[PDB]
Amino acid sequence: MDSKEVLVHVKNLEKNKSNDAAVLEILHVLDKEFVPTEKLLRETKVGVEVNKFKKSTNVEISKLVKKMISSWKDAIN
């Protein structure tokens, strides 16, 4: 995972950050098993939208993006 691509995504996340720390620390650690790979990168596109966790995509999305991790690699496999 490219922290550069992820932290940038956090920038977007920041704008949406209804929750500062959870997503902040969640996304940071997320970098380990994060969605930015060759194929997964596009998934990072959607992973970002989850990173956005807008209105209907409530902070709960944070854990959702985690679930997204499970399927994230599932797509790469």
Short mmCIF file of C-alpha atoms in Angstrom, two decimals:
data_model
loop_
_atom_site.label_atom_id
_atom_site.label_comp_id
_atom_site.label_asym_id
_atom_site.label_seq_id
_atom_site.Cartn_x
_atom_site.Cartn_y
_atom_site.Cartn_z
CA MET A 1 0.00 0.00 0.00
CA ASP A 2 1.17 3.51 -0.84
CA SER A 3 0.82 5.76 2.19
CA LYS A 4 1.05 8.65 -0.25
CA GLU A 5 -2.10 7.53 -2.06
CA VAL A 6 -3.82 6.59 1.19
CA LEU A 7 -2.89 9.67 3.24
CA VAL A 8 -4.11 11.75 0.30
CA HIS A 9 -7.34 9.80 0.46
CA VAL A 10 -7.33 10.73 4.13
CA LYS A 11 -7.30 14.32 2.92
CA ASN A 12 -10.66 13.62 1.32
CA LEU A 13 -11.60 11.64 4.40
CA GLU A 14 -10.64 14.75 6.39
CA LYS A 15 -13.18 16.88 4.55
CA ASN A 16 -15.82 14.26 5.35
CA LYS A 17 -14.39 13.57 8.82
CA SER A 18 -17.45 13.74 11.02
CA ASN A 19 -15.23 11.52 13.17
CA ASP A 20 -11.66 12.80 13.37
CA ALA A 21 -9.68 10.12 15.22
CA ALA A 22 -11.49 6.86 14.43
CA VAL A 23 -11.23 7.15 10.67
CA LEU A 24 -7.90 8.91 11.10
CA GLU A 25 -6.38 6.05 13.07
CA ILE A 26 -8.55 3.51 11.29
CA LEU A 27 -7.37 4.58 7.85
CA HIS A 28 -3.76 4.96 9.00
CA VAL A 29 -3.56 1.38 10.29
CA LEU A 30 -5.76 0.44 7.35
CA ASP A 31 -2.65 1.11 5.27
CA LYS A 32 -1.36 -2.29 6.34
CA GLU A 33 -4.28 -4.20 4.83
CA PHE A 34 -5.49 -1.29 2.71
CA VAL A 35 -7.16 -1.22 -0.69
CA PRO A 36 -4.35 0.44 -2.84
CA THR A 37 -2.84 -2.26 -5.05
CA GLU A 38 -2.48 -2.76 -8.81
CA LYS A 39 -6.06 -3.98 -9.26
CA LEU A 40 -7.26 -2.98 -5.80
CA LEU A 41 -6.25 0.65 -6.44
CA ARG A 42 -9.46 1.14 -8.43
CA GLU A 43 -11.06 -0.55 -5.47
CA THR A 44 -9.36 2.18 -3.47
CA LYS A 45 -11.58 4.41 -5.55
CA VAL A 46 -14.56 2.77 -3.88
CA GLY A 47 -12.60 2.24 -0.68
CA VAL A 48 -12.23 6.00 -0.69
CA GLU A 49 -15.98 6.51 -1.00
CA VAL A 50 -16.18 4.36 2.12
CA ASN A 51 -13.31 6.47 3.43
CA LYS A 52 -15.64 9.37 2.71
CA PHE A 53 -18.32 7.81 4.93
CA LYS A 54 -20.75 10.54 3.88
CA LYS A 55 -24.32 10.81 5.27
CA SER A 56 -25.91 7.42 4.55
CA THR A 57 -22.41 6.02 4.73
CA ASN A 58 -22.20 6.72 8.43
CA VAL A 59 -18.93 6.40 10.38
CA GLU A 60 -20.00 2.79 10.79
CA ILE A 61 -18.58 2.66 7.29
CA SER A 62 -15.16 2.72 8.97
CA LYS A 63 -15.73 -0.83 10.12
CA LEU A 64 -17.40 -1.35 6.76
CA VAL A 65 -14.23 -0.41 4.90
CA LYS A 66 -12.61 -3.03 7.10
CA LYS A 67 -15.15 -5.55 5.84
CA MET A 68 -14.28 -4.07 2.47
CA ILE A 69 -10.75 -5.26 3.21
CA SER A 70 -11.94 -8.84 3.43
CA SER A 71 -13.49 -8.56 -0.04
CA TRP A 72 -10.74 -6.18 -1.19
CA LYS A 73 -8.17 -8.95 -1.37
CA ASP A 74 -10.88 -11.44 -2.29
CA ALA A 75 -11.08 -9.49 -5.55
CA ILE A 76 -7.33 -9.69 -6.04
CA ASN A 77 -7.20 -13.43 -5.34
#
